[PDB]
Amino acid sequence: NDNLHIFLVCFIGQGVVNPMLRLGKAFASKGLLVTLSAPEIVGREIRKANNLNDDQSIKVGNGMIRFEFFDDGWESVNGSKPFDVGVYINHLDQAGRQKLPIMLKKHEESGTPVSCLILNPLVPWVADVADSLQIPCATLWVQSCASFSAYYHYHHGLVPFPTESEPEIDVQLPGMPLLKYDEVPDYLHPRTPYPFFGTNILGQFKNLSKNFCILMDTFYELEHETIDSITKICPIKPIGPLFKIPDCKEWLDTRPPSTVVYVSVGSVVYLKQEQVTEMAYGILNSEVSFLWVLRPPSKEPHVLPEEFWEKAGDRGKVVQWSPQEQVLAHPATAAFLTHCGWNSTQEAISSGVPVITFPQFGDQVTNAKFLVEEFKVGVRLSRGELENRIITRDEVERALREITSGPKAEEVKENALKWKKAAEETVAKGGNSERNLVEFIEEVARKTGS
């Protein structure tokens, strides 16, 4: 697979960059030439997060990933204004239609012509450029297949969704459990504060059929009923869990196995002080052992109760940052109170750690449904920010208690074990996800020699 050049185009944001980077390593391990391109406005963040070589590359086992940071024109256009992602995505669309063909032509000249373009739903113009340059392209879907099917059926108007006239109706999609109005990815709900986030993702479905493949970071055993339904309409290939393809640590090493509740919701939201207070007292009144990642005041205080520090004793630890993948694989970790982002969901499923669902917005509310009612590894704490209420300390203590001892805690712990074995199996040699990855590479090879 030497002659094969996979060229990935990131949007802005850890939620897109890390899945794309992980996929790029999946291709680099297999011996392909891989280029990860990303807008320069996130260029210094990406370049510090992984040390680039003197050719701006990283080693990935046998292969390597070259990094390519392109000018979106943004600083010159935007001046002193604050960053507005809605303005930015539409600007990057216009810029990238002109920039990408230029980067593609450069790779022809370097003797490394691009074999396949891989985009994501936030840069769907990449497929239009691919189409006019006769270059194959796939898109990486970075949410669940359940979330894919919701946006797909919304965009095509195939089933009624909550509207302004009818805001709390259920939605029944093919191959899926019934979705309550507030379990649809809620950027699609009329009440969302973020209608533009919905419009950006729906942007992918205007020209989705220009992609010969839709790679997805899930695996077949996790969503088999939805996959077996949607693949009759869309060329979806599950290739995940992507992250499993081949201070905090020293404090957990001293806890007994399966006793620490890992609490981290702040990677997508800054909570109100009032909610932080109820979380802190629920953590104390539950008496469980905990590791709490508490977002710092970016300089709303996130102050903890006076008693909290004395009452937490040796059982607790509060930190500013944590290596989430390391914590979730640690023996001491017993449960994950999470915002249920799709990456967090996949990491808990694949690490064998039951969850307490604290979703905030977007697909988090859909993932939370599946974690509790479908994957059956979760205890429900909230229904999302659209509910627009503070989760009280008593509800917080109930979730912590329900996940750590009793029949519900035993059912979710053993279900989490089954999911962990399934997720390991699907990326090992012979697994469904690893075979989809080999087949994807074979499909690109057949298009290169055509």
Side-chain angles (χ1 to χ4, degrees), residues 1-13 15-44 46-61 63 65-164 166-409 411-450:
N1 307 334
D2 91 299
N3 56 314
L4 294 199
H5 190 170
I6 308 310
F7 192 103
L8 297 95
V9 194
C10 303
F11 189 61
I12 260 37
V16 184
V17 180
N18 295 328
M20 227 82 174
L21 184 64
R22 291 172 177 112
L23 178 64
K25 302 184 181 164
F27 291 127
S29 72
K30 310 295 269 169
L32 294 59
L33 176 42
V34 185
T35 298
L36 183 95
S37 75
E40 179 57 43
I41 58 153
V42 292
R44 101 117 185 73
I46 295 176
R47 212 176 309 112
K48 281 175 173 55
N50 12 328
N51 197 1
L52 299 196
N53 268 161
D54 308 54
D55 47 16
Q56 287 77 252
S57 181
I58 60 191
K59 314 194 153 56
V60 185
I65 299 180
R66 237 191 71 266
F67 290 74
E68 192 159 329
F69 301 98
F70 60 89
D71 172 53
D72 46 24
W74 175 253
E75 282 295 325
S76 205
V77 168
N78 193 57
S80 58
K81 296 179 175 190
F83 182 83
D84 188 304
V85 61
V87 175
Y88 178 83
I89 181 162
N90 289 335
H91 167 92
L92 181 66
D93 189 313
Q94 275 176 261
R97 294 176 176 278
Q98 320 298 107
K99 202 87 158 126
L100 184 55
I102 283 164
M103 305 163 60
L104 293 186
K105 207 186 153 168
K106 189 262 314 197
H107 277 290
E108 281 193 25
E109 265 172 83
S110 306
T112 54
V114 177
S115 312
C116 192
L117 272 158
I118 307 196
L119 55 143
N120 59 90
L122 306 180
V123 291
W125 51 271
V126 172
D128 300 323
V129 171
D131 183 53
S132 48
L133 305 187
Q134 301 84 68
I135 291 182
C137 65
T139 182
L140 180 65
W141 182 259
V142 301
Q143 297 176 18
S144 76
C145 195
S147 159
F148 178 97
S149 172
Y151 284 96
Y152 182 94
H153 287 89
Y154 187 89
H155 179 66
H156 299 275
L158 305 178
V159 52
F161 282 73
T163 55
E164 299 66 14
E166 303 180 322
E168 290 191 2
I169 57 166
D170 314 315
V171 187
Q172 180 59 80
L173 303 173
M176 255 160 76
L178 187 55
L179 295 180
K180 309 254 47 149
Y181 71 93
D182 61 350
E183 302 173 333
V184 181
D186 63 16
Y187 301 152
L188 297 170
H189 195 274
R191 301 171 180 164
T192 182
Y194 322 90
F196 37 85
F197 284 160
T199 310
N200 298 345
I201 298 177
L202 285 165
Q204 164 78 100
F205 295 86
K206 300 180 176 181
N207 73 347
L208 177 70
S209 80
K210 291 191 195 196
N211 296 281
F212 77 92
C213 190
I214 303 151
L215 306 162
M216 191 170 291
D217 183 13
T218 182
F219 54 106
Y220 171 80
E221 287 296 346
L222 189 62
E223 311 196 72
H224 56 95
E225 198 176 5
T226 307
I227 293 161
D228 291 333
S229 190
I230 199 70
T231 56
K232 298 179 177 178
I233 359 199
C234 304
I236 287 166
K237 293 229 234 321
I239 55 174
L242 283 180
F243 83 103
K244 267 228 174 176
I245 290 152
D247 189 45
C248 293
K249 195 268 202 293
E250 288 172 348
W251 178 78
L252 295 175
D253 275 1
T254 69
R255 309 305 305 184
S258 217
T259 59
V260 175
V261 178
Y262 179 46
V263 176
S264 170
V265 290
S267 89
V268 306
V269 61
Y270 192 96
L271 303 166
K272 288 179 265 289
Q273 167 75 67
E274 195 180 353
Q275 184 65 78
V276 171
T277 293
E278 297 301 302
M279 297 182 75
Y281 275 118
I283 285 165
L284 284 186
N285 300 329
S286 82
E287 284 165 315
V288 311
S289 184
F290 60 92
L291 180 69
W292 192 1
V293 196
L294 194 53
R295 171 110 79 89
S298 298
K299 225 68 173 193
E300 213 76 348
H302 275 192
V303 170
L304 263 24
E306 291 269 298
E307 37 255 62
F308 185 97
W309 297 111
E310 331 173 81
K311 270 72 177 187
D314 278 70
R315 81 180 75 107
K317 184 173 160 64
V318 184
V319 299
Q320 200 155 245
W321 168 87
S322 94
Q324 171 162 302
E325 271 163 43
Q326 292 206 320
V327 176
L328 294 177
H330 195 286
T333 310
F336 183 16
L337 191 163
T338 167
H339 55 64
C340 314
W342 182 244
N343 183 63
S344 291
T345 303
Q346 280 267 263
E347 276 167 17
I349 284 298
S350 302
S351 314
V353 187
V355 296
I356 295 162
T357 58
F358 196 21
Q360 308 298 309
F361 39 61
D363 60 323
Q364 291 167 3
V365 295
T366 316
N367 307 346
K369 189 204 169 63
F370 278 76
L371 281 162
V372 163
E373 301 162 4
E374 293 302 300
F375 314 155
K376 276 142 151 17
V377 288
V379 169
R380 178 176 286 105
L381 181 49
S382 77
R383 303 197 60 84
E385 295 181 357
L386 266 184
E387 251 195 348
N388 182 32
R389 70 195 198 84
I390 304 288
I391 311 305
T392 76
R393 65 194 62 177
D394 281 353
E395 286 160 331
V396 168
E397 168 186 9
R398 174 180 187 162
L400 294 164
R401 282 175 187 285
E402 284 181 335
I403 204 89
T404 51
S405 67
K408 179 74 189 289
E411 180 199 359
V412 300
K413 155 134 140 195
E414 68 134 79
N415 285 342
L417 231 298
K418 286 191 244 288
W419 283 119
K420 173 190 178 37
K421 181 150 91 294
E424 298 166 348
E425 285 173 355
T426 193
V427 298
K429 202 186 160 38
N432 299 321
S433 281
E434 87 91 33
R435 278 168 71 82
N436 278 342
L437 174 66
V438 175
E439 232 193 336
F440 174 84
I441 299 167
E442 269 157 17
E443 247 200 282
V444 162
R446 263 191 291 276
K447 291 162 173 272
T448 310
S450 165

